[PDB]
From a paper:
As such, we found that a circularly permuted variant of a cage-forming enzyme, Aquifex aeolicus lumazine synthase, cpAaLS, assembles into a variety of hollow spherical and cylindrical structures in response to changes in ionic strength. While the wild-type protein, AaLS-wt, self-assembles into a ∼ 16 nm dodecahedral structure composed of 60 identical monomers,35 the negatively supercharged variants AaLS-neg and AaLS-13 adopt expanded 360- and 720-mer assemblies, respectively, constructed entirely from pentameric capsomers. We previously designed two circularly permuted variants of AaLS and confirmed that their morphologies depend on the positions of the newly generated N- and C-termini.
The unique triple helix is not the only tubular structure formed by cpAaLS(119). In the cryo-EM micrographs, short and bent caterpillar-like objects, referred to as “twisted tubes” were also observed albeit at a very low frequency (left). Since the twisted tubular assemblies were heterogeneous, we divided particle images into 3 classes and determined the structures individually. All three distinct twisted tube structures are composed of two compacted helical threads with 0-, 18-, and 28-Å gaps between them. This spring-like arrangement rationalizes the bending tendency. We also realized that one of the four pentamer interactions in the twisted tube has an acute bending angle (P0-P4 interaction). A possible disulfide bridge between two of the introduced cysteine residues at position 85 seems to support the unusual interaction mode, enhancing formation of the twisted tube.
Residue numbers in the entry:
A (entry chain L), D (entry chain B), E (entry chain PA): 14 to 162
B (entry chain K): 5 to 162
C (entry chain C), F (entry chain QA), G (entry chain BA), H (entry chain JC): 3 to 162
The structure:
């Protein structure tokens, strides 16, 4: 309820529903159209990509993600979980899941080293950059559940 | 020469980088395969058996002492996990700036399953933003996503 | 849902994982040592590969505090399988407590099939500046058995 | 139920059954073999070696040992009880019982003096050492029911 | 705890362990050998054959069978459930499961029509006969969880 | 005192006693049948002695209503011992219920060591003018096994 | 474990099962009626097959007492799948209560894709010798829609 | 099972044990004193052996609080037997209470067969700073009898 894994799952559910409504034909008129997503996960397929580094924390994050999906009406049969050695290769694995036509949304979970950098970090900047570019190119929601130690 | 061989190289960044490449290569080979029947949550993870896989390594020549221990660390990781020394292609480049372009050429071959990039970076004795280091990370990340083939990052700071 | 909660955990670093790797490395090392020698002309180096195909293993685990011990055993099995081993070639033996580990391990090590043994357990107290008799005997027994039978035995206990 | 004599008896029963199963031929295959011992004492012969020193406590320990064996289906006819002056000579007496072909397990019961030693005790270290070596050499379970005052 | 499905599962577990011990080599001697099976299901594979006729009752019976196996240390992953139209064809389906080398025991569950027969019933007599003959020929335990309405 | 109360009872007539004698007689009878023939010149008569020295037996007993079954088993053991048998040469197998007797008996009868098998158990109800399926199958199974393996099997069940 | 407890149940006889079969039969019957006629020379008989391959279905279900309704819906889906249908060709619509079934069903029946509609729900009370207005309207609405659009609509409600 | 529970106890230190040893030592001491003297030339030392073969003993025990007294008597018998005595040569006398011990002991000590007497009993109260008349008389009586008859009498009472 209070971990970033829970929050990341909710965002994925809402975005998946929102996309489903947008492709529908527009209304007749006579008012301002408003589009929004509901929080029911029934009938949706999800994928999760998680890193093993600093495993003490991620298991709690992956825990929340699976719990949230089921609690909101999702069927545990529809979750695909992929594990990778470190955070450097989350984007490449996420891309393989996102290209499957049977996946509606993807959730990325990981942990990054301390953020007391002098000015910049060269590994953290690539994970966020890659996921963002991937979402726009494939036109499919990808959620960022990464946290900083 | 025997003094050089006696040193241990388990655990250096060459070792970890190669180990990640082996896992990712097996993981992708599983994903492309047929999906499971169902009836449960379906988990994927890469095995650590390296037999039958082809690897490529790109290493710079700057600081010839540090690099060699890293390259030898990568090779022994592949061999000790079942790989054959006949299935490794090694490419050497003048400096860290031209690692991405060489890594691109290797990655486009159909006979390569993963690529490992090794090098060292010069650390100025005051913390400014390095315009060379950022370009290596940016270039390697783009290549992997575009070519859909895992590339591992094995550089260190002096 | 609890089945996925427990199955979603990872077991990559616990002492069961490292104990398994040492057994894999030592088992392969012995095959090379008692094989044919080298051609000479240079210093000869021996080291064990991490390929676990065709090797037979045995695991002895105590039952005290089974919540933690169960996770160590799962870690050991995962290490063997992920390195190419077959779950068909693992024998598991459970014993009441730590005092019984050396005698059970002695039975398994005398079989011709097995190539290495892994001992897993949790010791009592331990965090006191005093000599503990149960802890000393278990360490002594495993060490003596390995030297007598000339077969590697790995020591994967912890304190709590 | 709560004394070390009760616990020592249970361990002896379980180890005796476990050894009986191990000597059996291995299975066909197709799964991971798992070996364990059951808690039925029927048809098993036991021996007990107890010391007389500080007799106020040991009688309760020997009490538990005999009670546990009978409660779990053991026949009182199959218990052999041997008494010795002190703890120093438990190992030598235990060795004589363990070499009999009609004994399946041996239980050793005794009490040791206060454990507030400076660094080491020279009598306690020999009882545990001797019993452990004896078990491995003879390949027969020997249980340690000794306690510290 | 009180339904025939629960009882049938326990019998299958005990018989599977008993067979495992018998194939082991005999003891040295010096006493009467006694063989028995323990009630731990860990590492055992089971198969269940159930009929659909009068489904109101069998679901409770199949319920007990699966519950008993799990409660006694069995892994739900190792249960194979097969459903058949009626009781007449339980034996033929049970035979297909029993011939698999990955199955340790088979449980048959079904319901038979009222037992106020004049002298004999021609369908009930064949189910019991077939299962009994099948067990002896294949040398594998098959349990009878059938009940009479 | 209860140990002597139970030990002071006698077990000379219960169905366990007669079942054991039949096994002893049949086991000795078969040795003579498949031995050398007689000299002829007169009608040849075969009959089994009641000496139980050097014979191996196996007993299969169900666990339902163990109060009565335990006394039948003790009767069978007493008969063998009192006729010269050794308790070392008896194998005892326990099964959950009556339905499992024939399959267990089949396992024991296939061993080369054993010379006869004794089946003991208590059936359910029985005192009704109706055909019982469990009772019929147990009788059928034991009869078929004996004829197939050519080894005597004795039938010592009762009704209650 | 509850997932297998619910998954181990069977759904072969509930009203959802029969409602699905009627839709399958009627949908196939209409294809033959509006096809080419027979050769004559004998009485012509029309009847619908039970092959559900290539047919599109729609299901409207109320939400009152979802414990029972959920089981009726699962029964309907099982019937279609077990007769050769594809779960890809099923549309499911949920409505707050029984009063809203006819209007929702009207929307689905006007699509050119669908071949039959199945209505599922649970009515209130019902077990009283009185005329109920909600029950009468729901039955009336479905009957009128079927005749107007010339498309079969099946009626799978129950009382409780 | 209670027979082994009581039989498994030990009786090595209770006052019955020490009382028996004193009687054994004194009985042997008297035989040496009234025997032939030494050769002189050095200081002569007399002391009694602990060999109890060929000696006859008598035991007088009160019946109050028989739970404790019974254990003291068993301790005395064990001491005599374990030092080489025969249970055939022990006479046991039971009396109602402590007041009757001296008179009964006087009867046994006058027999020519017996060599020493052991008195066992439990006194009442005792844990009060007051002079008790029963306690004083019992001690006085035993002391006087020993000096008059010149035969050792041991005093093995306790307070509770």
């Amino acid at each position: 309820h209070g971990n970033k894994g829970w929050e990341a799952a909710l965002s994925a559910i809402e975005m998946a529903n929102l996309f489903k409504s947008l492709r529908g034909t527009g209304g007749s008129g006579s008012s301002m159209e408003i589009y929004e997503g509901k929080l029911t996960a029934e009938g949706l397929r999800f994928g999760i990509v998680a890193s093993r580094f600093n495993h003490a924390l991620v298991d709690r994050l992956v825990e929340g993600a699976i719990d949230s999906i089921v609690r909101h009406g999702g069927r545990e049969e529809d979750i695909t979980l992929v594990r990778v050695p470190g955070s450097w290769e989350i984007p490449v694995a996420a891309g393989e899941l996102a290209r499957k036509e049977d996946i509606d949304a993807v959730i990325a979970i990981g942990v990054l080293i301390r953020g007391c950098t002098p000015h910049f970090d060269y590994i953290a900047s690539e994970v966020s950059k890659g996921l963002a570019n991937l979402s726009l190119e494939l036109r499919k929601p990808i959620t960022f559940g990464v946290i900083t130690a």
